Write a protein that binds this ligand. Structure first.
Ligand code: HEM
Ligand SMILES: CCCCCCCCCC(=O)N[C@H]1CCOC1=O
Length: 454
């Protein structure tokens, strides 16, 4: 039984001022490097224990002992994502009901049905890049976010955001981005009722109303038309949970759609951006991935079966998720009093946060070369130890979107490598912006067309 380490304190504010940074995950990784596998983080009114080792994270991932917790940021995201799958407690009726309804819509088999819509948006990205002039460059996270938002709009509810036709966001997206920023900023406030935050609060309520009004109209329009498109909205209007025998109600459908738009905007685009960063910094890897794309993608339009054959492109994406897991943390609570790792006693209800970038740097698992980008670590999936690699979370509360995200990212990266050579023309220095997720801010490249028709 040991006392855990704790970072530097600020008197009556305890550790709370350490949250006052626009790069809080990267700040917490540096604290983990200094203090080790576990540290306590105290604020007036709450405590979190941050975990970084596979030894302790494997225990936290035992669903008989620990369940998903809503961290302060997820409690504030719940003001607009409601009891959708991401912001519900496991014990709320709507979690298991929506999980049972939606699981078949997110299976590997379901990807055959979404493939043609994903190809529509991927072709729009390739055509944008083919149409650039010699003196221009690509704004990577900006174009990846256009692509992933547009893909989930078309597969989620047959709606075209038309992100390649504008420089200014859709009204929904201005509101969603601003609401996510407010939710991510609320936990660092020592006095949330300070009148300095009144304008923030008015704008938050306004942004929630914009998102609710727009998605409620989409749902009401589809129910009126009777149209049966092969999207997630049709599946949610027609599905019934085998356990309760009930369908989702229109309020819960709205929260699921909001949740899917947050994920499409924030997560897959980060993965694609980090993958392209590591490829231009590691040209032997780029060559090996480009050789696979050329040999496999032999038709002007990729097929589902060809995307499945992009093994090395998949290894590149896993190694990008290892170093920069774009959703970089998840929270657990102790179901009962217990002892973590034979050393750290916990009370029922105690909150834990898993720092996924530190799990993925645990040299007791990955061996000594953890900061190197080496997709060959994933060449044989049976070589990865249990609970060492967790970019999609854990157990029944793991990412429902994992197969969707990896099919979209494999298709897009494969087409990018088939159609272009890439140049890091600025010698870009990695700068990681934090929203809900991690992305490489200011990352630019030049493409040179291989002149292969679509
Ligand atoms: C590379 C892309 C993605 C990554 C890295 C990722 C990561 C994660 C992680 C870490 C969790 C667990 C969160 C927690 O325990 O608090 C999660 C949950 C979730 N993700 Fe993703 N995600 C990605 C893409 C997507 C996409 C594309 C969708 C849907 C369109 C999606 C939908 C969800 C939902 C609904 C949950 C909650 C599942 C449940 O608890 O029932 N994700 N994701
Ligand atoms: C799906 C990606 C979510 C990533 C969450 C990143 C959160 C890192 C900072 C952190 O631990 N803040 C705690 C402090 C109190 O309230 C929180 O939430």
């Amino acid at each position: 039984i040991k006392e855990m380490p704790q970072p530097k304190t600020f008197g009556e504010l305890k550790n709370l001022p350490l949250l006052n940074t626009d790069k809080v995950v990267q700040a917490l990784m540096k604290i983990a490097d200094e203090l080790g596998e576990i540290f306590k983080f105290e604020a007036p009114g709450w405590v979190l224990r941050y975990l970084s080792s596979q030894r302790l994270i494997k225990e936290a991932c035992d669903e008989s002992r620990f369940d998903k917790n809503l961290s302060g940021v997820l409690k504030f995201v719940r003001d607009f994502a409601g009891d959708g799958l991401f912001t519900s407690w496991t014990h709320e009726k709507n979690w298991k009901k929506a999980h049972n309804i939606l699981l078949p819509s997110f299976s590997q088999q379901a990807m055959k049905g979404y493939h043609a819509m994903m190809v529509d948006i991927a072709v729009q990205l390739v055509q944008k890049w083919e149409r650039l002039n010699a003196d221009e460059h690509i704004e990577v996270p900006e174009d990846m976010t256009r692509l992933t938002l547009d893909t989930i709009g078309l597969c989620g509810f047959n709606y075209r955001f038309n992100s390649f036709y504008r420089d200014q966001p859709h009204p929904f997206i201005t509101s969603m981005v601003r609401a996510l920023d407010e939710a991510m900023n609320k936990p660092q406030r020592a006095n949330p009722d300070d009148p300095a935050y009144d304008e923030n609060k008015r704008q938050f309520q306004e942004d929630i109303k914009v998102m609710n009004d727009l998605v409620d109209k989409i749902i009401a329009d589809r129910k009126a038309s009777g149209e049966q498109s092969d999207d997630l909205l049709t599946h949610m209007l027609n599905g019934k949970d085998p356990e309760t025998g009930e369908p989702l109600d229109d309020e819960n459908i709205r929260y699921q759609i909001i949740t899917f738009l947050i994920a499409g905007h924030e997560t897959t685009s980060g993965l694609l951006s980090f993958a392209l960063y590591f490829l231009v910094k590691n040209p032997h890897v780029l060559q090996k991935a480009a050789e696979e794309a050329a040999r496999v993608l032999v038709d002007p339009v990729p097929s589902y079966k060809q995307v499945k054959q992009l093994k090395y492109v998949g290894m590149v994406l896993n190694e990008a998720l290892r170093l920069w897991p774009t959703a970089p943390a998840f929270s657990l609570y102790a179901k009962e009093d217990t002892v973590l790792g034979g050393e750290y006693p916990l009370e029922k209800g105690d909150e834990l946060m898993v720092l996924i970038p530190q799990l993925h740097r645990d040299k007791t698992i990955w061996g000594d070369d953890v900061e190197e980008f080496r997709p060959e670590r994933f060449e044989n999936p049976s070589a990865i130890p249990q609970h060492a690699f967790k970019p999609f979370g854990n157990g029944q509360r793991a990412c429902i979107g994992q197969q969707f995200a990896l099919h979209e990212a494999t298709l897009v990266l494969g087409m990018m490598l088939k159609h272009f050579d890439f140049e890091d023309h600025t010698n870009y220095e990695l700068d990681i912006k934090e929203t809900l997720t991690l992305k490489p801010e200011g990352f630019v490249v030049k493409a040179k067309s291989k002149k292969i028709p679509l």
